[PDB]
Amino acid sequence: MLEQLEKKLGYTFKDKSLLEKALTHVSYSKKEHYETLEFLGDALVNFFIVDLLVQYSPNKREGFLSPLKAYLISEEFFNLLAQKLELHKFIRIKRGKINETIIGDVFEALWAAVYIDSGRDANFTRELFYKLFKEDILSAIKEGRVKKDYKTILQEITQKRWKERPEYRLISVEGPHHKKKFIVEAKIKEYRTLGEGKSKKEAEQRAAEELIKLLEES
Amino acid sequence: KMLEQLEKKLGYTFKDKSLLEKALTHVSYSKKEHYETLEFLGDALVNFFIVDLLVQYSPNKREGFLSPLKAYLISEEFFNLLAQKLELHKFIRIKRGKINETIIGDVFEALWAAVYIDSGRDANFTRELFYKLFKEDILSAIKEGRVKKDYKTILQEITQKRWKERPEYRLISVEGPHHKKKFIVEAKIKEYRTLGEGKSKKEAEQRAAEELIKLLEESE
RNA sequence: AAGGUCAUUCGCAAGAGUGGCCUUUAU
RNA sequence: AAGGUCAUUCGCAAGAGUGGCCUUUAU
Numbered sequence: 026m027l028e029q030l031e032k033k034l035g036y037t038f039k040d041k042s043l044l045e046k047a048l049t050h051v052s053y054s055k056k057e058h059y060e061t062l063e064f065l066g067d068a069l070v071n072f073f074i075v076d077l078l079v080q081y082s083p084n085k086r087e088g089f090l091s092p093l094k095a096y097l098i099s100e101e102f103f104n105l106l107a108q109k110l111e112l113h114k115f116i117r118i119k120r121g122k123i124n125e126t127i128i129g130d131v132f133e134a135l136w137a138a139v140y141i142d143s144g145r146d147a148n149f150t151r152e153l154f155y156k157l158f159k160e161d162i163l164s165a166i167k168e169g170r171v172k173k174d175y176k177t178i179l180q181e182i183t184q185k186r187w188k189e190r191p192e193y194r195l196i197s198v199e200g201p202h203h204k205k206k207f208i209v210e211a212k213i214k215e216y217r218t219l220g221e222g223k224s225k226k227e228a229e230q231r232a233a234e235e236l237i238k239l240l241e242e243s
Numbered sequence: 244k245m246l247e248q249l250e251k252k253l254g255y256t257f258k259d260k261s262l263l264e265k266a267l268t269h270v271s272y273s274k275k276e277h278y279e280t281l282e283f284l285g286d287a288l289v290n291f292f293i294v295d296l297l298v299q300y301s302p303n304k305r306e307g308f309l310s311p312l313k314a315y316l317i318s319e320e321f322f323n324l325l326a327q328k329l330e331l332h333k334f335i336r337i338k339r340g341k342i343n344e345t346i347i348g349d350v351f352e353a354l355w356a357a358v359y360i361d362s363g364r365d366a367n368f369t370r371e372l373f374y375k376l377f378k379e380d381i382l383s384a385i386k387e388g389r390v391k392k393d394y395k396t397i398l399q400e401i402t403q404k405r406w407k408e409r410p411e412y413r414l415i416s417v418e419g420p421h422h423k424k425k426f427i428v429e430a431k432i433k434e435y436r437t438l439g440e441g442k443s444k445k446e447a448e449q450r451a452a453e454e455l456i457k458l459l460e461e462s463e
Numbered sequence: 464a465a466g467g468u469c470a471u472u473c474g475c476a477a478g479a480g481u482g483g484c485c486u487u488u489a490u
Numbered sequence: 491a492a493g494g495u496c497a498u499u500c501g502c503a504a505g506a507g508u509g510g511c512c513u514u515u516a517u
């Protein structure tokens with residue numbers, strides 16, 4: 026069933042045991058799993074994306090490119106690129122959902138696989154990667170489909186205005202001990218908002234988005 | 244130019260000298276044409292070189308084993324060590340300021356991005372050039388335990404397994420001009436205490452943590 | 464890495480670098 | 491990313507994955 030991936034990919038392995046290893050979670054083999062390929066793949070793809078950014082972005086200033094990169098090398102973004110490859114259909118895994126973290130790990134492991142299989146031909150792998158995703162990446166940027174970091178955007182707003190940082194405090198924690206929903210207040214001066222999520226961080230991001238919003242209505 | 248000497252050490256001659264010059268130029272010297280963007284590309288480029296090397300020659304290729312190696316091998320400190328081979332500091336163009344380890348580590352990244360660009364974005368070629376200069380020295384530093392230790396992390400792993408607790412760090416003193424400050428910090432776990440000195444809290448906590456680890460290996 | 468802040472340098476301002484601190488994001 | 495820990499799964503132990511929390515490092 027690797028052949029469907031090999032077509033979506035447009036590459037055929039000279040060693041299918043590499044491709045297999047890259048699609049295989051440890052809960053299906055503690056002998057041959059994506060972990061190591063995931064390590065190389067992260068470095069290899071971060072490089073692809075950054076290289077891409079320096080090529081096409083007119084504003085080449087590190088203060089501009091950086092927060093772009095923080096998004097385009099993120100698990101959240103890798104999962105989107107994986108959707109083009111229907112990556113979840115090829116993942117050797119037993120007990121556990123194929124959640125965003127697994128998908129992203131495989132996506133990293135995959136490109137490591139291609140790289141090594143091509144004989145560590147980074148030039149080839151890079152262009153193959155660009156063949157698949159360059160237009161998708163560049164279009165996300167152009168159309169503003171880049172996830173905003175509201176906590177950082179907020180704090181930079183309030184530090185310029187009041188030389189202070191907002192306060193996030195925990196309001197409630199409810200649900201089964203791994204299906205928890207957090208509710209968090211975010212406050213600056215006397216402006217107060219709420220957020221809810223499945224991590225303390227996620228709820229703080231929501232509240233902070235509301236707070237940015239609230240400060241603009243005023 | 245003088246660039247011929249660097250080019251010699253490097254084993255590569257630039258087609259575009261301006262490209263080389265930009266990688267060696269701080270913004271204090273030229274707000275128009277300096278190393279910042281190259282530095283950005285280089286960080287990703289060089290990290291990859293390091294990582295691919297680690298995966299290639301290491302028997303233990305576990306995530307949680309390689310990552311701490313990587314964490315030292317892609318650090319400003321370690322890049323300053325590689326820079327020495329090129330004598331990078333005598334080529335850097337900088338105006339009102341010393342050429343500290345941050346500048347050198349920055350230029351080390353930029354220079355590699357510059358070779359990369361100047362080669363027509365040939366990553367295979369650039370990676371082999373890096374290796375020619377640096378592969379043996381890198382592998383040998385790993386082999387010979389010349390890898391800097393993350394004491395604060397080592398220590399909290401020690402105290403957590405033994406006592407299910409993290410050491411406590413408290414500020415004892417600060418000394419000097421707000422831009423040339425010297426910190427003294429205490430690390431504590433149970434009744435064991437050590438002191439540490441540094442030019443930043445983190446560096447002092449690091450020295451404190453190291454001594455505490457030593458203390459714990461005498462009694463525990 | 465980014466923002467604020469203390470120091471310092473570019474005569475002050477604006478803007479920038481470097482050093483410290485605090486905080487925040489991504490990997 | 492690592493360690494501790496809560497939850498959960500692999501029948502328990504051992505080991506490992508996933509989700510939460512806390513802490514630490516590197517870029």
Ligand SMILES: Nc1ncnc2c1ncn2[C@@H]1O[C@H](COP(=O)(O)O)[C@@H](O)[C@H]1O
Binds near residue numbers: 490
């Ligand atoms: N918080 C962190 N501290 C140290 N290294 C990290 C951290 N996050 C990511 N890394 C490094 O980046 C590699 C790839 O990360 P990842 O894509 O999240 O699996 C890891 O194996 C580590 O070497």
Ligand SMILES: Nc1ncnc2c1ncn2[C@@H]1O[C@H](COP(=O)(O)O)[C@@H](O)[C@H]1O
Binds near residue numbers: 090091092283517
């Ligand atoms: N703490 C950080 N938060 C976010 N991005 C970072 C951080 N440290 C390094 N980076 C990213 O890595 C790039 C290279 O870092 P550097 O080698 O320190 O100049 C930066 O330009 C950022 O894109």
Ligand SMILES: [Mg+2]
Binds near residue numbers: 067098133
């Ligand atoms: Mg990654």
Ligand SMILES: [Mg+2]
């Ligand atoms: Mg992981």
Ligand SMILES: [Mg+2]
Binds near residue numbers: 063067129130133
């Ligand atoms: Mg990863």
Ligand SMILES: [Mg+2]
Binds near residue numbers: 225226
């Ligand atoms: Mg928190």
Ligand SMILES: [Mg+2]
Binds near residue numbers: 286317
């Ligand atoms: Mg770097």
Ligand SMILES: [Mg+2]
Binds near residue numbers: 282283286352
């Ligand atoms: Mg850098």
Ligand SMILES: [Mg+2]
Binds near residue numbers: 349
């Ligand atoms: Mg910098």
Ligand SMILES: [Mg+2]
Binds near residue numbers: 464
């Ligand atoms: Mg900075």
Ligand SMILES: [Mg+2]
Binds near residue numbers: 491
């Ligand atoms: Mg982990």
